[PDB]
Structure formats: C-alpha cells, structure tokens
Predict the structure of Major capsid protein L1.
Amino acid sequence: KVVATDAYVTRTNIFYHASSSRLLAVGHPYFSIKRANKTVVPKVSGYQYRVFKVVLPDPNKFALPDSSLFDPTTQRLVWACTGLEVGRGQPLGVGVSGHPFLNKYDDVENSGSGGNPGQDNRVNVGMDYKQTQLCMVGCAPPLGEHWGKGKQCTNTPVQAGDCPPLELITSVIQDGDMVDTGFGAMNFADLQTNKSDVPIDICGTTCKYPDYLQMAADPYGDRLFFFLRKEQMFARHFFNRAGEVGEPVPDTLIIKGSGNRTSVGSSIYVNTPSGSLVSSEAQLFNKPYWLQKAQGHNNGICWGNQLFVTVVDTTRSTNMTLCASVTTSSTYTNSDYKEYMRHVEEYDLQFIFQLCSITLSAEVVAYIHTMNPSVLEDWNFPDPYKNLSFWEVNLKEKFSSELDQYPLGRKFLLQS
Amino acid sequence: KVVATDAYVTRTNIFYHASSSRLLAVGHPYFSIKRANKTVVPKVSGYQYRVFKVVLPDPNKFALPDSSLFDPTTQRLVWACTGLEVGRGQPLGVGVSGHPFLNKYDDVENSGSGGNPGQDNRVNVGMDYKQTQLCMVGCAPPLGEHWGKGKQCAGDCPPLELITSVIQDGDMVDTGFGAMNFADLQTNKSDVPIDICGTTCKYPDYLQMAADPYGDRLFFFLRKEQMFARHFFNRAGEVGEPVPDTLIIKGSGNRTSVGSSIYVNTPSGSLVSSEAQLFNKPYWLQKAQGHNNGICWGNQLFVTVVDTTRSTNMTLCASVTTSSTYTNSDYKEYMRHVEEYDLQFIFQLCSITLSAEVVAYIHTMNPSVLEDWNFPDPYKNLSFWEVNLKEKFSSELDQYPLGRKFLLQS
Amino acid sequence: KVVATDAYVTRTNIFYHASSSRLLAVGHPYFSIKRANKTVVPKVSGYQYRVFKVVLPDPNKFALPDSSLFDPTTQRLVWACTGLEVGRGQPLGVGVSGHPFLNKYDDVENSGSGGNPGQDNRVNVGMDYKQTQLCMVGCAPPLGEHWGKQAGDCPPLELITSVIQDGDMVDTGFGAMNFADLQTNKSDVPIDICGTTCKYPDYLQMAADPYGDRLFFFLRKEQMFARHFFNRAGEVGEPVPDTLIIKGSGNRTSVGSSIYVNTPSGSLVSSEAQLFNKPYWLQKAQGHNNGICWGNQLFVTVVDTTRSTNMTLCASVTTSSTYTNSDYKEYMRHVEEYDLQFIFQLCSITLSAEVVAYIHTMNPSVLEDWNFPDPYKNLSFWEVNLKEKFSSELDQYPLGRKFLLQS
Amino acid sequence: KVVATDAYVTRTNIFYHASSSRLLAVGHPYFSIKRANKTVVPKVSGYQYRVFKVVLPDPNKFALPDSSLFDPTTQRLVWACTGLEVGRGQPLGVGVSGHPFLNKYDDVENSGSGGNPGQDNRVNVGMDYKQTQLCMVGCAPPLGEHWGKGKQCTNTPVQAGDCPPLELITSVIQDGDMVDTGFGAMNFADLQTNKSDVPIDICGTTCKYPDYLQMAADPYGDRLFFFLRKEQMFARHFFNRAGEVGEPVPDTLIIKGSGNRTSVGSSIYVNTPSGSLVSSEAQLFNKPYWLQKAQGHNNGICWGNQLFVTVVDTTRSTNMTLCASVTTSSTYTNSDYKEYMRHVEEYDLQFIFQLCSITLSAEVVAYIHTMNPSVLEDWNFPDPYKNLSFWEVNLKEKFSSELDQYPLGRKFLLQS
C-alpha cells in the first residue's frame, strides 16, 4: 500500500552543493534575559535542541540550464538529499548547570542520625549533565517524547495534594527545546512544582527525548531519513530530598527502631549525573554522511522543497566566564566586579542534493493526494508549522552546481 | 536420540511480521502501593525481569491465502522465529536505591578505634546497583537460580541451597549482593536496600538451560554485566563466626575488643553508553544453540529482558499549600519509574510431515503438541507480561521497520 | 631427542563427550570453621585455585563397541583432549577481604608530623583484591612459585616452586609470598591470606619443560591499581640513610616511618572480559605433549575472581517489635559453581622397540600400568570422576554440539 | 574556476630528505622573565602553539645534478611534500598551572551557606588542563578563532559597567599563542578584567582554537594540506565566583525564602578541567604521515618554497621543579632554598619532498596570477608575514638526495 519513493521518483545526474556558511548564536546558558518586556539576551545552552528548517529553492521554478529534462505537463521536480556534513566550530568542553536553592538535604553516601529537616534546607549546588550527541534528517520535523501531568480523568474530587497522574506526551521538537540531562524526559513545570528539584535551566522548562520508535514506525517515514546518537552518563553523587515523603515505606520492609531512630529518615533519592570524558574520537560531527538508503520508505525526498536537521551536541557546552570592573582601585575587592555567563554555538551546515523528476500518472496523482495533497497543490497540478519555531536556514540563492569548489562537494566527488 | 528440528521440520517461503506496538508500565521503583487491600500503584523498577509471554495465532487454524501449502492430514503447521528486535523507548540513565535503616556501622576504608556498637546504628544510605543487560528467547520460560534457606537435613547460620525456578515478570535481578532470597536469609530486613530486602533476586542458570536436551528454553541469549566496589563498610550486630586467634595477636592498650569483620559492599554500575547497548537493533536467529532451531511450539514465545541502562527514577513534587515563601512542609515528594517497550518479530511458517517415527519422537518431549493438533496449562500459576499477537500478524513485510530491515538483510 | 606426541601417537575418528555436571562448594570466604577438632565449614573464597583432577576411564579396559580398532599386543589406547569448556555459574561480582587489626598507621597520601606511634594502632580495614582470571590444562599438576623464608634482622628470601593444590591462595596485590613465615605479626595483610601462602604460576618453567606435561595451554587476565597509600606501625627495620635527607629540627627531629602499604583494587569486572562459558579447541598445544592424557588423567586449574561476591547472612536470635543489634548474628558465606565439559579423541600407540625405549624414559608407569603408590596422593585436589560419564552420542550435549559444527 | 594542482603541476621521480635535527626550547611554564627591560627567560609551556615556518631552498636556483629535468625555457620547479614525521623527544607527562589568587569561593558540589562573601576570598588553587594534540601542514600559516571584546556597535553610551559584547575574531596563529585549556577560546585580557578568574599562565593572554571550518572552506586550500586532532577533558571540580552576580536568577525560577535564605547564593559556576590519562597508544607523533591526497585543491604544493607546520602537544607538558640552596646548614629550613619552575620541548622535524615541474602556458600564467602573483614575480617570469612570529627552520643546505641515509627516508623507500 505504501511504497518506497524509488518506485515513482526517477533520479537524474544533476547534483548541487549548498552551504549555510558560519552560523552563530550567543547568549546565557541558564535563562533568557528580558527587561522589562522583551528578550535582550537569548538562552543559549549546550543542552538545547538545534532544529534547522532548511528551505530549498523550488526546482520547478529554478533557473536550470536546460528545461529539456522534464515536460512541465505531467512531470514535476523535487530535490533529494544525498550528502550531509554538520560542522561544529567550537573547542570540546563541558559546561555545568546548577541551582542556588537545590532541594538537597544530606549526602546519602554514608551518613545519618541525625535529622530532621526544617523549614528551608535548600543548598547552592552545581553539576555537569549527562553527555548527549544526536542528529536527524527528514522532510518533516522530528517527534519528541516526555512525561507530563496527565489529567485526573475528569470525574471525581478526591484526596488533594497527592501525586500527579503521569501521561506520556509525544510532541514536535522545536529549536531551543531541552534535551534529557539525567533527570528523565519530563515536564518539570508541572511535575516538580517547587522549582527547586532540578537546576534552574530546566526547572521551568520541558526536557524532550526523541521518539525513535514512533518516527521509524510511521508509514511514509518523513521524519527519519536516518539518525545518529551517542549518550553516556554515570551517577556522580547520592543525595535525598527535603520535605514530606509522599509515599512512605511500608512496615513489611523495615523493623521499626527505638533508641533514637523512631523517626524514619527521608528516602526520596536524587542523583547528580555526569557526562564523563568528551573526546574527538567520540565526535559525530565534522564528517560527512552519505544517504545511500533511508530507514523509512521516503528515501531522502525533500517534499515541499524543505528539509529538517535536528542536532544536539553537549560536547561543546563550555560556558565562558566574563568579568567586568565596576570601579578600578589598586586593591582587589569583590564588590568592584560583576561576573557574567555566556555560552556559544558555531555551526556550518553543508548539503548535497540530487535533482529528481516524477512522472505523474493517474495512479501517482492518487497516491500523492493521500500523504499530502499540498505536494500537488504547490505543484499547481497557511503553514501549520508557523506556530512552531525553528532555526531558519535559507538556502535559496545558495545552490551551486560547481561541486568541486566546496569541502563537502570535493568529498562527494571522491566518494560514494 | 534427540535430533535438531532441521531433520523433521520443513521450512517454507512464508514469512510474517508482528509488532507489539508501544508497551508502557509505570510505578514506584522500590515497592508496590496497595491501600488497604489491593494494589493501586505497581512496583516498576529497572532491576526487574521483563518476561513477555508472546502468544501467536495457530497457523493450523489461520486464514492463510492458500491452503495448498500443506495437506491437513499428515502435515501440521508451526511458526519458526527468524527475526527479533527489542525496542527500548526511554533515555539512558541510572537510578539508585536505598534504605532509611541500612545496617551500616563504620566506613571500613580507613577508620577504626572505635566505640562499641549500641542498640540501633542503622543509617539512611543509598547506592547505584550493578549494571545488567540481557535478553533470551525460547518457546518455554527461562530458568533462574538463587540461594535460599536450605534445610538442616538456636539462631545459628542458615544452611544454603541453590534453588532453580522459573523467572517470572517482576522477579528481581541480582544487584551486586548475590542471587539469594533476602526474605529468608537476611531476617532483619535492613542489610540490603528496601527494593530487594523482602524479595528474591534470581540469576539465569545459563549452564542448565544449555544442558537441556531439546533446548526449548534457550534459542539464544545476550548479556552485559559490569560493576565495581564503590565503598567499604562493616555490619552492626553480633559476628556469628569470629576470627580465630591463629590469625591475630590479641591486643591490649584500648584494643582488647575486636571490631566487627562483617564487611558489606556497595556496587556501582559505572558509565552507561550507547555503544554498549544490546537493544534497538535486530537479531537474526540463523542457527540456534540447542536442538530446537527456533520452533515456537504451542504458538507461544518467551522473551526475557533485563535493562538497567534506563533505570532513571523521575522525581515528582506536588504542593500542598501555596504561599509566597518556601517551607518544606508545603510539599510532598514522590518517586515514579517507567518502562517503554516495542517488540517486533519476524516468523517463518513451517510444516511437519507426521510419519510414525515423527509422531513417536514428538510424543516424547511433549505429547500436548500432538494433542493440541488433534492428531490445565501448568504455567498459569506463574505471571508474565502477556502480549497477544493474534490479529497482529501481517504478511506485508515492507510496511514495517523490522520487516524492511529483513528484506535488505539475511 | 624429545619429540611431539604426533610422531608416535596415531589418531582415530572416535570422539567422546564427558561432563561433570554442576559442581558446588560453599563456605566462609575468610577461614575454615572447625570445632573443636575437625572442620565444620570449609574455606571457600573467590581467590582460591580450583585444581580439578579429572579421572578418565582406561581405554584399554573400556567397553568400546569394537575391539577391531587396535591389536592388544603391541598397541595400547589413550585419550587425547580436543575440546574443553570451563563453565562458571554465578553472577559477576566482587567480594572484599579485611583484617580487624590491620597494621595501618597514617593515611600517607597527604598528612604527616607529628606522630608518633604508640603501642597498638591497628585499624579495622577491608579492601577489594586484585582481579585475576586464569585456566590451565595438562596431564600433570601445574607448578606455582612463591617467596618463603645475629638475630632480629630481615629474613632471607627464597623463591620456592611447588604443586598448586585445590584451595591454595592466588596473589592478591601483596605479592606471591608465604605470609605465615615472612609476616610474623599476622596483621600486615587481611585475615584470609595472613596465615596462608599465595602462589603464582611458574609459567616460564612449565613451558620450558621438555615434555610439556604441565602446559597444554593457558589463559590469563590480571588487573589492579593502587587504591590507597598507607604506612606500617612499628620500628623501621632499615632506616633511610642521611645521604637522601636533610635532617629536620623545628618539630621534625623524629623521622616518620617509610614502610609504605598499598591497598589494591581489581576495578570493573565485565562480561566482555570473561574467559569462561566458551569452548577451547586444542588444535595444537604449546608443549611437546599435544593433548595426550597420560595415565588416563587430566588436570584443570582455574582461578576466577570475577564472581567473588560474598553473601551476607543475618539470623534473628530474638524477635521483638524493636530493632536491637544484640538480637541478630551476621554471617559470611561464599559459593563457587562449576560445570566442566570435555571432548576426548581416542588414540592408539604402536609399541616398537624404539617406542618402548622412549616411553620408558619420561615415565615407565605408562608402560607398567599398560601391563607391557601415587606420589600425588599427598597433594589434595578436587576429584572429578568421569568414568561411567563418557558418551559417544556427541549431539546430545552442549559442548558436543559445538564440536560437530566447529573444528 | 579553481582546479586541483594535479592538473597543472607535473610530478617527477626526484625525492629528497630534509631533517631539522634536535630543536630545543627551555623556559618558564607560566610567564616570561624580563629584568628590567627585555626578556631573560622565555615562557615555555606545553599549552603553547608550535608553528614552524619551514624555509626550503629555491629549486630553480638549486644545484641539481642535471638541468635536463626541466627546460628553464617555460618549465618551473616547486617542492611538494609527500612525507612528514614530527619527532617528540620528552617523556610523557602532565604539568599543571594555577593561580595564587584564583577567584574561587565555595565548593559547590554539596555545600551551602552560611554567607556572605566579603572583600577578598581568592584562593591559591592549581589544576591540570584539558588534553590536546594536533598538527597541521600547509604553505600558508593557519587561522585561529577566539572570542574577544566586541564593539558596542559605536553608537550610544548605555548602562556603564555591564557585560562586554562578544565577537568571534579570526586571526593568524603565531608561535607561542595559547591553546584552549577548558575555559574557552577567548581573550582573557579583555573579557576577565580582574585577572583572577583563570590561572596565571592564561589570565593575561589569548587562547586560540583552530578555525577548521574556515580553512577547509578556502578555495585554494593553501592552509590545510591535512590535520590531526585529539582532545579530551572532564569536569574535575565545581566552584562558584565571588563578586556581584551580573545577571540574577529571575523569580520565575525560584521560590524566595523568608528567613536565613533571603540572600540568593551566587549562581556563577567555574569548573576545573582535567586531561585525564595520557598514553603512548594515543600519540600522534613519532610516526610518519604520507601525503597521498590533500583536503584542498592544493595537493601538497609548497608555494613560495616554504611550508608551515603547526603543532600542539600537551602530553609532554611536565614542568621540572628546580631547587637552589641559599645557605647550607645542618638543618632543613625553608628560608634556605629557592624553588623554580622550568619546562622543556624537544623536536625533530623530518620531511621528504618530491620535485615537481610546472609548464607555464598563457593559461597557466593567468591561473597563477590570481591566487598569488608573487609566485610569478619571485620566479622572475616586503613579506606581510614578517609582523607575525614563527619558529624559523632553515632547511636550505639540508636537502639530501641519499634517502636511505636517514630514518624517514628509509621508511619512504620501503613504503607508500
């Protein structure tokens, strides 16, 4: 019923290079800065998704050298992706995140007696997150998964203040969305209401994880051309939370103490992750990928003359420390300096596209109407993604047929 | 006497795809929550065995396109497993377990002197467990082994016995403290963390299941274990068996009383990495280890999975009373763990010509194979994660992920 | 002068499988328990050698299907080993050992001055040992090496070679020495080796032997690192000369002890590092003996410290509604699970005048037992009786199945 | 427009060996020593770039055995690099750097206060840097990138004393420039005015990172024949800064305290990197590289009879401790000794060049005019790099045709 694009999309010999040139975003690794109405400094963190919306020129309106390739009646043109190199341009390094009032109580590794928690015990603790690398390509934006506050199933009023119901939400990954950091793929705005259980750069945001199982199990496979991933983390420390234990340990698992241990210590464990070493040998980027065969049925066809590249790279999350002098004297005084935080991301997207033609028979027109009819409507044979926000990359007027003039173009000639 | 299924099970060209779709289980990583009679929240932990009872449609009553493949008289049909992909759907991460009253006394790494033990010295300590990955396939449930209280043939040391049993869904994996029955051999409930202190941790008896005649339990298996010693402690309480005098020179000057030499070990699973993952990739059963070369007798199939590389425990926090100031008494903190699976299979249809020798050889092994062919289930006392794949078989291989991979491979 | 067994031992097509089934030993990881005369609970530790004396049935008295294979006059039969799988049946894990009065003084990593040591400064410290895996096969027991022993001075050192017995201790990171003699205070190493001898295999000798009866082949995996740095209490037997120091005043007149200690650690254990649960095919041996089981016996030596987890047992002396330490007794128990599988190839030996001569040297009891006291009964092994366990139906068994599809 | 040198550069059978012999530089790992006007002891640190300007003899003025190889009438000679071995001659080891007044406040891993910072809380702390190995070859010096104090876009005076604007500057990497150490590729002299945020060997200098994306994006590719890299680091400790928080955490991300915790702890984190293990198995040096095909269009042609080798090697950064006695007495007294710092670098550069000829047609003369006309002007058919500083290596009078007499020459005969 659903067939590979190989059946009805004919390939040509026309290859093109396109480069995004240097891409830079500079800001604060923890939070956006807006005073007092709109943003002055954007939130730029190594743990954010980078989702590029690559806009391609319409080959049916493209100034090709010869129009003899296709008949305008019954044939249409479309770009196919055959080569890709996501360039990363910063030194390898790890940045850390924290919370001046993290809900930490005791170091759980070997101490207790010895309570009990009071009114405010929040600590100023920082940590390095789990290491994560991933990149995806498709003609439709990727899907993320995360846990959010499920409805109570609208019905009855019961005991209030209880645990929130959990529900697995799938959603579209937007540029700037947070990656999982070692605390799970969940909606911290709803499920951790005290704002003090996770560091400040995620305590009021949502960490989404890619729904690999769904995007590959989608029929047409427009979300997954291919993907790559490298995750690693270990448990660095062991703490416990302050506050009421929402679900106490049953008596079947303990023998109640006396002689000072009548009050049970809190067993709400938190764990600081750590991404360990980062190495060049572990890098996924600064190297080309050749799309010989895609995982789904869509074998790299950029329907709608667009293309989505989703990138997460925490191996260059180093946060630069800036220090400005308020008053210059011959002595060091802490009050004379202001310390700031700044993080950066440098990208270079290079693509290589193959021109393809599609002879539109009555069967092809029917098969294309289902899936998406706007493929036909835009062919002359509103965008629901304008509510979503991406890093727009305009590669119109950037296509070049002279492959050998460019790095990825040179590699493509000598390879594949 | 026992022969490979290749001798009397003829292969066809008929292949089928079947997928369980998304499977979700959500609960408490340490214990089930029941008030006050039946369970409200199940115990769902990354250190539990996931044993799926995959039910297949009977090919002898299946609506095949053509019945010309086999003669119903003297031939019967059975599914053969040729492809498998165990899908895992959560971010990699590590969760920890603990005990508000763990029987820890001293940090034994570099300190002693030491004051004698009192009446209650239990500490609130948590730890990360040993890392474990494994998957098994067979037409019969796997066997686990663990140490329990053996018979004697007042309160001295208990006799030890290694028990073999069937691994059920929800059984606990070994965590670094051994494969034993903590409910019986550790009576104080305070020697291991609370999520295993009243349960039994079983380890698969690889040596036995492979030493089985027909090999119906092990089609194949994969494993990745790793742990190291993170800390060194000792126990509080009476040392049941003291160190002999031949190994010490008794002290005076403050050191007349011997410190306790009952040492404990906190494990650690160390780093988890994508490069070490066993799942989210297909396995092709080209040749099995045992005699049963992938035949799913009874139209059923058992998949056992342990995956501690996605054991992250989510922290939930609800506000009881909202004020402009933070006060600990205004919040309730909860614990929740989740598991997401997507099982994909590829089966090969097979026919068996029943000669007098074939009927005889099949009667031994299991006669219900013949009785169900028309030519009570003792596993219903056990509990598994039931997956009903009837009405889920599809012959259009190329429409599915694992099906697509199978065409271009094998 | 000495030739490979391939020259005068003719191979047949007759192969046999034999399995010991599950072998279990359970005890205390630190010491054997005897009250008050003989042992009640044996010493079972992950750092012990497992030396199996595999007894084979006499092929010259074996009930073979046809006696047409060999002529009893001038020909004799003997088994040749071609396949081996050392099965281990416990979860991977690490156990630790210690000493309630370990001779530890100061943490030497970054602290000193001033002391000073008193009369008793021993501490209750435990540690995890060096990680070690090894296995050997031969028709003669393997050789181990270890260091053994005016007044008051240091003892002279001597490297002794000896037979590795079942239950002997492996090196743990403190050296291959006789702690019973060279460490007289019983408090320098943990209690499970402080009154025993840790032996290391003399690999260089067993391979340098002419006939090579001790080494058919061997495998090894050792790893350790220095976890902590300590020093010893007591008088420094050999003081540091003044050429290497500038003597201090201003509080440092008394020199600190420079007798350094090292707690080892075996680091991670992983499945990828395992040597066991996989078959070894003896296609060609290292020594001259290419797998011939002289005397119808075979020695398998195994060390596996990757399953040294020590189980903690807790029994209740008195049950009340409150926890009190005096109501419980805590115990220690360690276990070892083995499954030995072998595959032997029948061989015949035509005894010419030269063959009888060459066989007389090496060992004449090969001829004497052929009809053509055992000095190892003072040594102790884990006896494995494979008589009545040989089977010719290879495909009925795990290792037998692998041998058909391989080699 | 731009073609590979294979099109217009003809190869010969003439190969030559050249070796720099032992090269030694010895100095102070932290700072240069000048009293009171010019330098007495140079700064020699394992974290410095080693950029060798290798000068080759003019083959058109070379005493070749026969002038019959080329017709002086319309054929010209140029050396092409085909073999290279960068010899390192010191034991593997790690050195550390520190700061007697590092702006460290609290250990942020699991502690909170108990405040508040006073006037001076700087600590004497040292650390081991991120591990870095890299080498490049070209006929033009490499480009580095770093973040510097950007202009306000010269327009308006706004709030004075705030964070400085950031700008990504590309520049030429000179010998002695600092590599990235885990604190970013930035200009610490401008962006950290208190001189106390990073260790003293980088606190008043600029750390440059190679702009791989740009040098590969150049048409002629004269800067990158090839390159190698190995970076690795992890976060060893977690601290925070003293001084005013330049950008405070918004209230949306915290629940303010009423007592004792009214003053928010500082959320400006620092992280000590660590280069972890260094091993022989990870070494890039003491092994030959055969330049079979270059990345750019310039396939190893040494235009201008020169060649640039840029090397960073922190795996032999051990700093030797020297101790001199001021007064000899029978007792140890700290006032009787002076302790010094000394670091060393030992190199042995070996090259193997292939003689090449270029037939100068009207098209060749035209194509060579663009790129660089001094290629023609110096052929007879001021140097703007004299403001930059390199380690000059004169290989004139060092070329030898007896390949088998030398280590790299011997390997070249039996290989490639």
Summary: Chain A touches chain B through 88 residues (CB under 8 Å).
